[PDB]
Chain A
């Protein structure tokens, strides 16, 4: 015929347009789930970090006993400190870096060694990519050095 469903599909064209932007509205709020999931992860570990207060570091001077250890702190004072029975008691030996509590002064845990930022500056200088070729003239001095 001439006209009798042309206009009726004019209406379903308007619906169709709106539907596909409703698809982009589904995807938009799904894009806000991820953005906000990261931003909650950084500020949630931040409250746990606030609530996990700093502990003072020493090193073991001298085992007195298997329950009593003498440490020299990094605040200065030598203490006789206890041990919490949640860490080793055989890796407390002299020269060993440990952190101890500030509010009952008991050893919380063993730590690897701790090395100064001045000696870390010295290691972070290792730059100069120049080869033994680049020493001209004094190549004899290189055999001798070796």
Chain B
């Protein structure tokens, strides 16, 4: 029920409730060191998150360019040598200059197509062919997804 009280004198013994009281004095010394550790640990994490957010928010801010998603090419998550989905890589071995992670192909509205490692903040479920996604105006990284736009002839129909 609840330990360490007169009800429990009957069920156990006097000596038992005391060694319990004594063993929990052992226990609690340990638990104040760990709670303090873990408290500090989440702070270090949160503050590196805010540091991250300030870069991302600069890029997120207006304006930004508009592209559609040609296709999702796919690339292996093996960065500990090379990509070999079906296209083996030659020459020199690299962490991330030809051994990159998963990939997005986009078609911009400046009349080109660009091959980038897909952004680690947009998931590969939210990338599928023919989605309209925002892209960074002066680079080309996918910040976010957008609802498909139409013409103004189409918005008249509404």
Contacts and interface: CB of A to CB of B under 8 A. Distances in A.
| Contact present between A and B (CB < 8 A) | yes
Contacts of B64: none
A85 B92 contact: yes
Contacts of B45: 33, 36-37, 40
A112 B70 contact: no
A73 to B, nearest CB: 8
B111 A49 contact: no
A41 B69 CA distance: 24
B120 A49 contact: yes
Contact of A54 (B28, B42, B139): B139
Interface in B114-158: 114-121, 129-130, 139-141
Interface of A: 5-6, 9-10, 12-13, 15-17, 19, 22-23, 25-26, 29-30, 32-33, 36-37, 39-50, 52-57, 73-76, 84-91, 99, 108-112, 114-117, 120-121, 124
A120 B90 contact: no
Contact of B113 (A12, A17, A25, A57): A57
Nearest to A29: B38
Interface of B: 2-6, 8-9, 14, 17, 20-21, 24, 27-28, 31, 34-35, 38-39, 41-42, 45-46, 48-49, 52-53, 55-56, 59, 68-71, 73, 85-92, 94, 96-98, 100-101, 105, 107, 111-121, 129-130, 139-141
22 contacts: A15-B4, A26-B34, A37-B45, A43-B52, A44-B120, A45-B121, A46-B56, A47-B52, A49-B116, A49-B117, A49-B141, A53-B116, A54-B116, A54-B140, A55-B115, A55-B116, A76-B111, A84-B91, A87-B89, A87-B91, A88-B88, A108-B98
